[PDB]
Amino acid sequence: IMEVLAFKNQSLIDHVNDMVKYWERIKYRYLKTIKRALEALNIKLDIEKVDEFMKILIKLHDIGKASKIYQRAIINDQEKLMGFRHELVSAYYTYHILLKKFGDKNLAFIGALTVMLHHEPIIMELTAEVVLDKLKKFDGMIEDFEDLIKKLIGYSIGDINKDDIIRFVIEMSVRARHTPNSEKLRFIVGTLLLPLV
Ligand SMILES: [Ca+2]
């Protein structure tokens, strides 16, 4: 009742905490691979940094669910998503939060892109039009939002609107369509993706 939900049954906070706890149990199987993948994009992070980075993707990849529309659709089977895609809104917050925490535009981009693509099956179109389709019904985050982020990541999205998210996502989808990297970009995003699920 009245909680920011991941699923009808589950609060998003509880769901995130379960994914994080589970990350601790497997991370040492994945950390080296992720570190060296980042290193093939000339991004240099030690093992503990890579861990923090992964925890943020874990915590934020479904933050888009705190959209009022998403929350409505979970509680009520009269309200429908209407093409709304939470991950685009997740990608937006992930990017700004990564940029703050690590001060590396490429890392924040790659993290946000992973989050923007966390629903495509592993080893994974991007027109401005489609962005507009997938954000059409976006009508802001829930009221508790700022507090929710604090609970999740420990600070304030105050300290760092719909059309702003549209602009960001379009700008993202483009710079991602354009890379020759493709086979590699798919492998790096593909690499960060596995641990998420
Ligand atoms: Ca998701």
Ligand SMILES: [Ca+2]
């Ligand atoms: Ca998942």
